[PDB]
Design a protein around this ligand. Structure first.
Ligand code: LFM
Length: 149
C-alpha cells in the first residue's frame, strides 16, 4: 500500500480538531491526508494534501518529530500534529469535487472506538461516521497528555 500523509490540526485551546468529509467511499469524516507521490518527501506530501483538502498551508508549522503514525491493513498513515490554529481560520478546499465539508470537532466528544452490536447478539461494529478518524483519537489524546498535560 502507498503511504499516506496529512495532519491533525488543533485549535488554540487544544479542545478541537479539524476533520474533513469526502464523498462516496470517503463519505465520513477523517483527518486530511492522501497518497505520497514518487520521490515526494513525507512533510511535502502532508502539506500538499492538507492544502488541497482544506486550503490551509501547514508548511511553516510542521514539526518533524510531532506526528502520529499508524499501520492499518499494511498501509502506513502518518499525520503531523499541528496545534494552535485559530478556530476562525477560513478553510476552503481546492476542489469541492472531493471535499463536502470541513469542520471542527471536540476531541473529548469524538469516539475512540466504534460500538459493537451486542444488544442485537450480532458480530461486528455499528457504522460510525468518524470511522477513518477513530484509530487516531486515543493515540492523539495520549500524545497531547505527554506533550502538554
Ligand atoms: O479519508 C476518508 N475521509 C476523509 C477524507 C475525505 C476526502 C479526502 F480527499 C481526504 C480525506 C475516508 C472515509 N472513508 N474512507 C476514507 O478513505 C479510505 C477509504 C474509506
Amino acid at each position: 500500500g502507498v503511504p499516506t500523509y496529512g495532519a491533525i490540526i488543533l485549535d488554540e485551546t487544544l479542545e478541537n480538531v479539524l476533520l474533513v468529509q469526502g464523498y462516496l467511499a470517503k463519505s465520513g469524516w477523517g483527518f486530511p491526508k492522501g497518497k505520497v507521490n514518487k520521490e515526494e518527501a513525507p512533510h511535502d506530501c502532508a502539506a500538499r494534501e492538507v492544502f488541497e483538502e482544506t486550503g490551509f498551508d501547514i508548511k511553516d508549522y510542521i514539526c518533524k518529530d510531532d506526528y502520529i503514525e499508524l499501520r492499518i491493513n499494511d498501509q502506513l498513515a502518518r499525520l503531523y500534529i499541528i496545534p494552535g490554529i485559530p478556530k476562525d481560520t477560513k478553510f476552503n478546499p481546492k476542489t469541492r469535487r472531493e471535499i463536502r465539508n470541513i469542520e471542527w470537532f471536540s476531541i473529548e466528544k469524538l469516539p475512540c472506538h466504534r460500538n459493537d452490536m451486542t444488544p442485537k447478539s450480532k458480530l461486528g461494529l455499528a457504522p460510525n461516521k468518524f470511522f477513518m478518524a477513530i484509530p487516531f483519537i486515543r493515540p492523539l489524546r495520549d500524545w497531547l497528555s505527554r506533550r502538554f498535560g
